[PDB]
């Protein structure tokens, strides 16, 4: 499939497409013991979305299936490519375990819409993708999802996270405002906020994470730009 084509790019900080050997009833997957993202590969058979983890050393991996008519595991192969710091800690504790939320939904779209428009920066360490857009730039949805956590944090500054399902999660960071609330929902290309300078950054900075069973992976893949 086109999904297929287009998601498949398994690379340490990339997404393994794999085959569940499932078409009935929705299986549950996990890799590395963490649930990760089930869908019908264009209304057919079950594949697993995985996010392959920037450290991951190239090789063989298994992923665990589980299903009522029976457990079963599935391997597939990844590829070459000031002031308290218990304010920290806690920062650091709320987006740990934003990224590992599992709602039971499925994501509005998997190839994802870029957030700004405007030229993409840095590279994808640097854990997600920028943009060259200057500050006050409109943010919007690149799925549809719910806004799980939203802080003003000592490093990343206004932050935002957007649950698109499943583990499916961008998170946006260093914003000048946040135009959304906890729990909102909102569609794709609902505008989150505006491109901003806070926390730890230099001049305007653009931020984008694209998060998968709690793996940071290249936002590029979801655009259509790896790489
Ligand atoms: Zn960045």
């Given at each position: 499939?086109?999904?297929?084509?287009?998601?498949?790019?398994?690379?340490?900080?990339?997404?393994?497409?794999?085959?569940?050997?499932?078409?009935?009833?929705?299986?549950?997957?996990?890799?590395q013991?963490?649930?990760?993202?089930?869908?019908?590969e264009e209304?057919?058979?079950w594949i697993?979305v995985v996010?392959?983890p920037l450290?991951?050393?190239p090789?063989?991996?298994?992923?665990?299936?589980?299903?009522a008519t029976?457990?079963?595991?599935?391997?597939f192969?990844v590829?070459?490519?000031?002031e308290?710091?218990?304010?920290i800690?806690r920062?650091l504790?709320?987006?740990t375990?934003?990224?590992?939320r599992?709602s039971?939904?499925?994501?509005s779209?998997?190839?994802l819409?870029k957030?700004?428009?405007?030229?993409?920066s840095?590279?994808?360490?640097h854990?997600?993708l920028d943009?060259?857009?200057p500050?006050?730039?409109?943010?919007?949805?690149?799925?549809a999802?719910?806004?799980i956590?939203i802080?003003?944090?000592f490093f990343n500054?206004?932050?935002?996270?957007?649950?698109?399902?499943?583990?499916?999660?961008?998170?946006?960071?260093h914003?000048?405002?946040?135009?959304?609330?906890?729990?909102q929902?909102?569609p794709?290309g609902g505008?989150?906020?505006?491109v901003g300078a806070?926390?730890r950054?230099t001049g305007p900075?653009?931020?984008?994470?694209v998060?998968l069973?709690d793996?940071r992976?290249?936002?590029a893949?979801?655009?259509?730009?790896?790489?």
């Open positions: 499939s086109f999904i297929m084509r287009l998601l498949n790019k398994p690379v340490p900080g990339g997404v393994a497409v794999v085959d569940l050997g499932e078409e009935g009833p929705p299986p549950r997957a996990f890799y013991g963490k649930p990760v993202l089930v869908v019908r209304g057919r058979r697993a996010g392959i450290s991951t050393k090789g063989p991996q298994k992923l665990e299936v589980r299903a029976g457990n079963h595991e599935e391997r192969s590829g070459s490519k000031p308290d710091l218990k304010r800690e920062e504790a709320e987006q375990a934003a990224y590992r599992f039971p939904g499925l994501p779209n998997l190839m819409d957030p700004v428009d405007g030229p993409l840095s590279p994808f360490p854990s997600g943009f060259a857009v500050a006050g730039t409109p943010i919007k949805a690149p799925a999802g719910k806004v956590l802080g003003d944090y500054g206004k932050t935002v996270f957007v649950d698109h399902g499943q583990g499916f999660i961008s998170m946006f960071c914003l000048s405002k946040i135009d959304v609330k906890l729990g929902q909102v794709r505008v989150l906020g505006k806070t926390g950054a900075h653009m931020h984008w994470n998060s069973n793996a992976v290249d936002p893949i979801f655009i259509g730009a790896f790489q």
